[PDB]
Scaffold this active site. Structure first.
Site, PDB file in Angstrom:
ATOM      1  N   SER A 101       0.836  -1.211   0.000  1.00  0.00           N
ATOM      2  CA  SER A 101       0.000   0.000   0.000  1.00  0.00           C
ATOM      3  C   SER A 101       0.869   1.259   0.000  1.00  0.00           C
ATOM      4  CB  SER A 101      -1.043  -0.095   1.112  1.00  0.00           C
ATOM      5  OG  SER A 101      -2.038   0.891   0.962  1.00  0.00           O
ATOM      6  N   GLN A 102       0.737   2.172   0.972  1.00  0.00           N
ATOM      7  CA  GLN A 102       1.599   3.356   0.948  1.00  0.00           C
ATOM      8  C   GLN A 102       3.092   3.006   0.828  1.00  0.00           C
ATOM      9  OE1 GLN A 102       2.659   7.482   3.360  1.00  0.00           O
ATOM     10  NE2 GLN A 102       1.005   6.208   4.151  1.00  0.00           N
TER      11      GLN A 102
END
Length: 187
Positions: A101-102
């Site tokens: 994700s991030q």
């Protein structure tokens, strides 16, 4: 005895795995895909792997997903510094890397900024729930496509240029063996 800071702690190992966690995950490797891959690498190459998470300047906060490159400049700089440090502190190490994700935005932002010499030491990168997948056409910018494997589950909407978090975003446990296998094959 504790995990995720093994490049900073030393000793150098033949394999250094650098991983950036997902938003909200605590610690350095996080609590999901990062340890899952680290542990698989350690079982396959016992005694040969140092796992290093990107933190603590990378805070994995939710708001940073909306910044230009999908994370903070501090996080990108920290990750970039860890790649550089692996190569200088441990000249014989081979690097593999990943994010979730991030953390995939951290990886893209850091790796695209590295010199070719440091990039050549990074043998493979695995990206789960790649938040820059659409924006970067399924790769990391300024880095070979064949060294990156992207895991974007069907219906994980963050791979479609949004920040919408839907259930398939949390389905990557089942991909961690494939990811480990890919990294080992690149080594």
């Amino acid at each position: 005895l504790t995990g995720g800071d093994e490049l900073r702690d030393g000793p150098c190992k033949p394999i250094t795995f650098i991983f950036a966690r997902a938003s909200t995950e605590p610690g350095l490797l996080g609590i999901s895909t990062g340890p899952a891959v680290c542990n698989r690498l350690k079982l396959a190459r016992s005694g040969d792997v140092a796992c290093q998470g990107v933190g603590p300047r990378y805070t994995a906060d939710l708001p940073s997903n909306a910044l230009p490159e999908g994370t903070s400049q501090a996080a990108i700089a920290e990750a970039q510094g860890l790649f550089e440090q692996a190569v200088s502190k441990c000249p014989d190490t081979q690097i593999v890397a990943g994010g979730y994700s991030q953390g995939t935005a951290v990886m893209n932002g850091a790796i695209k900024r590295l010199s070719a010499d440091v990039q050549d030491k990074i043998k493979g990168v695995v990206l789960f729930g790649y938040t820059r997948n659409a924006q970067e056409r399924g790769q990391i910018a300024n880095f070979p496509k064949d060294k990156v494997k992207v895991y974007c589950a069907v219906g994980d909407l963050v791979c479609l240029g949004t920040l919408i978090v839907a259930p398939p975003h949390f389905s990557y446990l089942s991909d961690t063996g494939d990811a480990s296998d890919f990294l080992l094959s690149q080594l």
